[PDB]
């Protein structure tokens, strides 16, 4: 199938309560593989997947060097952003960053990303052409001009098309037994009597990887788009995911309802009835 690699990082100022915290995380698809926490004692990029552990001490040294320098850069970036906005130093602020690449099943480059958010809102983003920036406001427009004058886009193009796809490919091969798997959902319905004239039907999906899935309710062939409670896809903690969709049902009307389930691990969509 097609795959992705992402790195996410968050710097948060902790005014009066210490120096900014930096946390970076690396994913291949819905699987985490590395982490760096500035607060941790280790002060190193650390393994988070069995298949990354095989990388020699050189990898861990370089990765540590790159993430530490990024940590310190983002600490100055918070100070720059405070200045751009004339914000009080009493306030706590967050810079988030995401970068990485998509590849196809044959391993070819499909898409590159390199984008920032300041205080949970878009700041600057590399456009799909990997040649220009989308700046969200006047402060980001200032950053954008500095980045145009410095040819930063060209550095990111070269990383996203180069090191990023090479790394993703190596990880996908080394972690083939895990990454290349697609665990279809174990599905079931439950019934919970509420009152006299009502009960909840709940449709479960358990133990699926990857996280993408669709769950849908119908009352005899017709969709039930607005009476369905649908929770967020949540991690089971073991590599897999869970989700449920529920509808409230008039007593004696359970037979009218069907649950519908779509996942890439499923040759054909499941239908469930009580």
């Amino acid at each position: 199938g097609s795959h992705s690699m992402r790195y996410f990082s968050t710097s948060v100022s902790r005014p009066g309560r210490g120096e900014p915290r930096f946390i970076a995380v690396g994913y291949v698809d819905d699987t985490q593989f590395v982490r760096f926490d500035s607060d941790a004692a280790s002060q190193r990029m650390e393994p988070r997947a069995p298949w990354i552990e095989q990388e020699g001490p050189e990898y861990w040294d370089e990765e540590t060097g790159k993430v530490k320098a990024h940590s310190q850069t983002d600490r100055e970036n918070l100070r720059i952003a405070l200045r751009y906005y004339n914000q009080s130093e009493a306030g706590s602020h967050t810079l988030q960053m995401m970068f990485g690449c998509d590849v196809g099943s044959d391993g070819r480059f499909l898409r590159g990303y390199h984008q920032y958010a300041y205080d949970g809102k878009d700041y600057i983003a590399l456009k799909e052409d990997l040649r220009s920036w989308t700046a969200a406001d006047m402060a980001a427009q200032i950053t954008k001009r500095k980045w145009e004058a410095a040819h930063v886009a060209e550095q990111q193009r070269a990383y996203l098309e180069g090191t990023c796809v090479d790394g993703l490919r190596r990880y996908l091969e080394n972690g083939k037994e895990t990454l290349q798997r697609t665990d279809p959902p174990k599905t079931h319905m439950t019934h919970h009597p509420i009152s006299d004239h009502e009960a909840t039907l709940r449709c479960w999906a358990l133990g699926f990887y990857p996280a993408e899935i669709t769950l849908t309710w119908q009352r005899d062939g017709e969709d039930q788009t607005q009476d369905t409670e649908l929770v967020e896809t949540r991690p089971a903690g073991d590599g897999t995911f869970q989700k449920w969709a529920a509808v409230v049902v008039p007593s004696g009307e359970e037979q009218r309802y069907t649950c519908h389930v779509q996942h890439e691990g499923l040759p054909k969509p499941l239908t469930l009835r009580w």
């Binding site: 790159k66 993430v67 990024h70 970036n77 970068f99 990111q156």
Partner: peptide, 9 residues
Amino acid sequence: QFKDNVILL
């Protein structure tokens, strides 16, 4: 593999 990039805002 993390990017090799010091970039300031």
